[PDB]
Design a protein around this motif. Structure first.
Motif, mmCIF file in Angstrom:
data_model
loop_
_atom_site.group_PDB
_atom_site.id
_atom_site.type_symbol
_atom_site.label_atom_id
_atom_site.label_comp_id
_atom_site.label_asym_id
_atom_site.label_seq_id
_atom_site.Cartn_x
_atom_site.Cartn_y
_atom_site.Cartn_z
ATOM 1 N N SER E 2 -69.124 11.750 -49.792
ATOM 2 C CA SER E 2 -69.264 12.095 -48.384
ATOM 3 C C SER E 2 -69.149 13.594 -48.148
ATOM 4 O O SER E 2 -69.794 14.124 -47.239
ATOM 5 N N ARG E 3 -68.350 14.295 -48.954
ATOM 6 C CA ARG E 3 -68.100 15.712 -48.719
ATOM 7 C C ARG E 3 -69.261 16.605 -49.125
ATOM 8 O O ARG E 3 -69.272 17.781 -48.746
ATOM 9 N N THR E 7 -73.859 15.830 -43.266
ATOM 10 C CA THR E 7 -73.100 15.464 -42.075
ATOM 11 C C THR E 7 -71.893 16.375 -41.900
ATOM 12 O O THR E 7 -71.537 16.744 -40.775
ATOM 13 N N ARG E 8 -71.268 16.769 -43.009
ATOM 14 C CA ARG E 8 -70.155 17.702 -42.930
ATOM 15 C C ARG E 8 -70.634 19.101 -42.579
ATOM 16 O O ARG E 8 -69.927 19.840 -41.889
ATOM 17 N N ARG E 11 -71.264 19.473 -38.693
ATOM 18 C CA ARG E 11 -70.130 19.403 -37.783
ATOM 19 C C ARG E 11 -70.079 20.663 -36.930
ATOM 20 O O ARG E 11 -69.928 21.772 -37.453
#
Lengths: 193, 99, 203, 207, 148
Positions: E2-3, E7-8, E11
RNA sequence: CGGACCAAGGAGUCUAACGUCUAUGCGAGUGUUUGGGUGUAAAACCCAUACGCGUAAUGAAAGUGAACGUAGGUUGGGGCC
RNA sequence: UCUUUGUAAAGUGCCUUCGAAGAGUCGAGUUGUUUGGGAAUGCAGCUCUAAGUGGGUGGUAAAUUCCAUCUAAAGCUAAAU
RNA sequence: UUGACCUCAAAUCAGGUAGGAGUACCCGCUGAACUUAAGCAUAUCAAUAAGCGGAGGAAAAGAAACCAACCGGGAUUGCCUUAGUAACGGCGAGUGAAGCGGCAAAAGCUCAAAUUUGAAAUCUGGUACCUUCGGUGCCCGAGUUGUAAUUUGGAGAGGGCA
């Protein structure tokens, strides 16, 4: 919905599949439990080999007929040729099959010599008297591995006759294809003198 | 019939030596036994005759066997059963007219 | 052996001798109740070959089921939905009238196990079935181990699950390529073929 | 739980009520009445993307990849630089790899097992464990992971005779068969150079 | 993981990589293969030509065991003899001692003729064969017999 | 148009099938983990048979099925001599 | 231990007579539902309604001719799930 | 008149049994619609949710009226594959198996159709006793419109011969 140069992906997930996802977290847990079930089965029926003896049968269809495998059970003719009653064969660990029939000699010969080897290698404990101190061989399948039948010598000689075996393939396809019309032609030529 | 040793044709397949084994008792489920032929003959004597079979018998003797086979196919399932019933009707007509 | 004669005689249902017996018995069963008790079967050949032994603990009932289709119980004939489901008449019940017959009898005799059932008579309005039942707590059935399988607690209300021969037919439980949807039950196959079986190491 | 945030019969009030369009709990007179639900932003609602069991947990590795990394981890134990850089006390070890006699494998008692390891030079690396016994930072200490400590030496044997029992209670040491060579033991934290004592029979069967 | 997703990195940015004007919706073009003849016609004509229509005749109850015919070319024919005997069979090309190749034993139904077997006599057992495969085997001195 | 203010919670996540790209291992093969053996025990280790995809396409199908040559010639072509 | 337990059960080889095997059931038509099943996969309703070297199946309806494979319309049964 | 038989009753008769709960899984029946098809009617959702009936530690299925076309396999079930395939589908959206192969587990059988006919040999109930998840003795019943032994198609029965 339909974008870019992508292959058409037929994904079948328009039902309520999330109610029916089965995830096998118990794959390691069932393997331990299956081995524990095998261990407690062998403890129950010691010293028999935990599985019956299966015949060497030929796999069906043209894709798999090059390889032999394990059958469900021996035939009535195979067990009778080995020289024992089929009910007696069930009791001493030989799986016997009543619907499989014998129509191949080398499969019949391989199965009866499998039965001769099984009867020579096991002993039957007496009903009365002291049973002998006999160890348990845990795998009858590993005791009797299934070998492929003998086909040919690794090297041989050349029989060059020039019979054109591709033309043999082409003619046999043609005379298979044209058999009924030639027989119909031979019929009408006979009843028209 | 022996095979050909080749992959295609009439008798495609490997050459093998068969045994022609002991035949099963099944394959003989429809075999007519002596007591069962006796029972069916007695039942045919005492049941009289069916209403469509009465119609089939007068269709044989008056309107033709082809017409009766058409009617017996309309009565029973197919022509494999219509031909069996018309042959049965022909036999019992000949049994009624003999002796 | 008289049951050999009885079976081939009873096959001739359009015979004059058995049509008259059909005509008399269809009146008698009409005048009796919908579910009543038969003290002895009117087809003892069919009873013997379906499993009925004539010892105490074996019970025969007789039942009539109204023939025809299953009308959809929707008010005023209106099925509020898509036009493919708008039909109210010409809707056929998936279980047979034999299966309905065993169901109503098994509800009447909740203390008995439905062994089998068989057609005896019919008219325009009714179909008549003689349903073989057993007393699972009778000592002649709890002893004599040929028949003590039915007092096992999994066989109770077997006609309400489809375990009898009418239910085995109506569920489509047969061996074949014709029965690929319904081999071990159509819902068992539907679960098996619609589950997404995901493993620890994904394939 | 797949019913979490959904053991609720909240229905949206629509517009025309001067409140947001979120589903709100009906009924009355409980404090929960009129409260928003059925959303990630709501108290008592479900989380966004509820965690499912069918997430990929175990990861498939090629068998040749696993043997490649194991052989690299075994080779890194013979490097004196990688064992020292990983955080082991091998400054007084006379030779890397440290190979001892086969009679280590027949040791039955922990009392002679620790005296064996102190004799062959693993005394400082055993003292590096059980002086580093720290409470775990974070919420994992009440998830049955209460204590952290460093990993001491590894002892690789060929045939078991009691050395796995004798080194079970020694902290930080792990005992590994020469058939297995667990990469989780040979490269802890993806860091090469676990301090490994081999036995003579394990060194011979490593051929 | 995820990292390492975008999407990160999105932010703070309002539309999360989806645009202010476009306003990323549920299904703006349809669902699945929606409108492959009406409003995704250009996609289904450019990138997937052949999608719409009944070509061919229907084959009821297809089993791939009937269509089992994996093909072995002549340059891959000599892979079948193992390396412990391959050098002894390539050298000293003898008519009397010719290597037999049970091609069906590995699982190739038909031998094709992509070419250039060495000039050795080789015995080939076949279910099917092509004309050029036989001519090159005949040119090398080998023979093809048929098995089933 | 939303926003009285403050605190906490709060929105491109997961899966199946893939596409491009990248990394890694093996490479005309590849993929152990359906299963079996073993284990310090849901880990790790080891393993056979198949099967998947690839090594052959083409036709609706029956079928057929890839070297004339230093695997061709011409033009350009990094690098090498 | 056996006066309970051998005016006992079970199997094996010939040869001969045979060999009983499930009916408003299969099947056909039509209807409705269902199926991947497509001249109709299954089920059910209604109508017709079998046979005994018979019947079912052999994934294109039908006729003719074989071949192959089983034995329905009665019933029980652990484990793997 | 008196004894039956058959059928149907009744009893706070003697002994039993069924209901209801739970319902995660299972066996059926019934059964939608939102949805998708960028509309929508077939289709899809889905032979699903809800409803209803019925069980158990599993249930179901289960020893072929099977698959196959092979050198043939061989109850059922489940997994990997077959396969997102053959096929279905306003052939649109989408839907979609099965045989084989490998593995797990493997276990097979029982009635009806035959006259024991040189002996209903079978069983429930009561009563008495004992060594009581029952046995024996006796009696009343059930049963000849058929309960036992023998046979279940792989066979099997009868008749000698050793």
């Amino acid at each position: 919905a339909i974008s870019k140069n992508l292959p058409i992906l037929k994904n079948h997930f328009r039902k309520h599949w999330q109610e029916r996802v089965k995830v096998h977290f118990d794959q390691a847990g069932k393997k331990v439990s299956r081995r524990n079930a095998r261990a407690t089965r062998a403890a129950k029926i010691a010293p028999r080999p935990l599985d019956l003896l299966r015949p060497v049968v030929r796999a069906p269809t043209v894709k798999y007929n090059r390889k032999v495998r394990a059958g469900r059970g021996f035939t009535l003719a195979e067990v009778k040729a080995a020289g024992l009653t089929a009910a007696y064969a069930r009791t001493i660990g030989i799986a016997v099959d009543h619907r499989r029939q014998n129509r191949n000699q080398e499969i019949f010969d391989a199965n009866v010599q499998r039965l001769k080897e099984y009867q020579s290698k096991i002993i039957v404990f007496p009903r009365n008297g002291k049973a002998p101190e006999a160890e348990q061989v845990l795998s009858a399948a590993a005791t009797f591995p299934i070998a492929q039948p003998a086909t040919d010598v690794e090297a041989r000689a050349v029989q060059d006759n020039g019979e054109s075996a591709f033309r043999t393939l082409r003619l046999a396809r043609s005379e298979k294809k044209f058999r009924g019309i030639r027989e119909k032609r031979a019929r009408e030529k006979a009843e028209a003198e | 019939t022996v095979k050909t040793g080749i992959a295609i044709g009439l008798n495609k397949g490997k050459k093998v030596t068969s045994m022609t084994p002991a035949p099963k008792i099944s394959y003989k489920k429809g075999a007519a036994s002596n007591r069962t032929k006796f029972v069916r003959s007695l039942v045919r004597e005492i049941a009289g005759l069916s209403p469509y079979e009465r119609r089939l018998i007068d269709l044989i003797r008056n309107s033709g066997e082809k017409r009766a086979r058409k009617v017996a196919k309309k009565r029973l399932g197919s022509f494999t059963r219509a031909k069996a019933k018309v042959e049965e009707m022909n036999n019992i007509i000949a049994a009624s007219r003999r002796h | 052996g008289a049951y050999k004669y009885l079976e081939e005689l009873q096959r001739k249902k359009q015979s004059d001798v058995l049509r008259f017996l059909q005509r008399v018995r269809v009146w008698e069963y009409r005048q009796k109740n919908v579910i009543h008790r038969a003290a002895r079967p009117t087809r003892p050949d069919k009873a013997r070959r379906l499993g009925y032994k004539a010892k105490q603990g074996f019970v025969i009932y007789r039942v009539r089921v109204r023939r025809g289709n299953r009308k959809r119980p929707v008010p005023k004939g209106a099925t509020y939905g898509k036009p493919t489901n708008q039909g109210v008449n010409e809707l056929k019940y998936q279980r047979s009238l034999r299966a309905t017959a065993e169901e109503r009898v098994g509800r009447r005799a909740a203390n008995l196990r439905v062994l089998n059932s068989y057609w005896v008579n019919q008219d325009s309005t009714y179909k008549y079935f003689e349903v073989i039942l057993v007393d699972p707590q009778h000592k002649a059935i709890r002893r004599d181990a040929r028949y003590n399988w039915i007092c096992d607690p999994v066989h109770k209300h077997r006609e309400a699950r489809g375990l009898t021969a009418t239910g085995k037919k109506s569920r489509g439980i047969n061996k074949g390529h014709k029965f690929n949807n319904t081999k071990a039950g159509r819902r068992k196959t539907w679960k098996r073929q619609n589950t997404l079986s995901l493993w620890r190491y994904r394939k | 739980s797949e019913k979490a945030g959904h053991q609720t019969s909240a229905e949206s009030w629509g517009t025309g009520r001067a409140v947001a369009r979120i589903p709100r709990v009906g009924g009355g007179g409980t404090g929960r009445s009129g409260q928003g639900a059925f959303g990630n932003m709501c108290r008592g609602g479900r989380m966004f993307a509820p965690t499912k069991t069918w997430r990929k947990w175990n990861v498939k590795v090629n068998h040749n990849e696993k043997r490649y990394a194991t052989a690299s981890a075994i080779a890194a134990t013979a490097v004196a630089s990688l064992v020292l850089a990983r955080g082991h006390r091998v400054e007084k070890i006379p030779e890397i790899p440290l190979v001892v006699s086969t009679d280590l494998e027949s040791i039955q008692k922990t009392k002679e097992a620790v005296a064996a390891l102190k004799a062959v030079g693993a005394h400082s690396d055993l003292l590096k464990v059980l002086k580093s016994k720290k409470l775990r930072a974070g919420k994992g200490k009440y998830r049955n992971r209460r204590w952290t400590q460093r990993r001491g030496p590894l002892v690789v044997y060929a045939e078991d005779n009691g050395i796995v029992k004798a080194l079970r209670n020694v902290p930080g040491v792990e005992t590994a068969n020469v058939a297995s060579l667990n990469l989780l033991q040979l490269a802890p934290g993806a860091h090469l150079g676990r301090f490994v004592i081999w036995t003579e029979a394990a060194f011979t069967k490593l051929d | 993981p995820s990292r390492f997703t975008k999407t990160r990195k999105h932010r703070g940015h309002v539309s999360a990589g989806k645009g202010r004007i476009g306003k990323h919706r549920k299904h703006p073009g349809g669902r699945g293969m929606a409108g492959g003849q009406h409003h995704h016609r250009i996609n289904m004509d450019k990138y997937h030509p052949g999608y719409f229509g009944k070509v061919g005749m229907r084959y009821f109850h297809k089993q791939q065991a009937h269509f089992w015919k994996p093909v072995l070319n002549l340059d891959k024919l000599w892979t079948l003899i193992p390396e412990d005997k391959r050098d002894q069979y390539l050298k000293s090309a003898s008519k009397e001692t010719a290597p037999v190749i049970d091609t069906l034993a590995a699982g190739y139904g038909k031998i094709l003729g992509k070419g250039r077997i060495p000039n050795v006599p080789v015995i080939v057992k076949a279910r099917f064969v092509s004309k050029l495969a036989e001519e090159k085997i005949r040119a090398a001195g080998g023979v093809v017999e048929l098995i089933a």
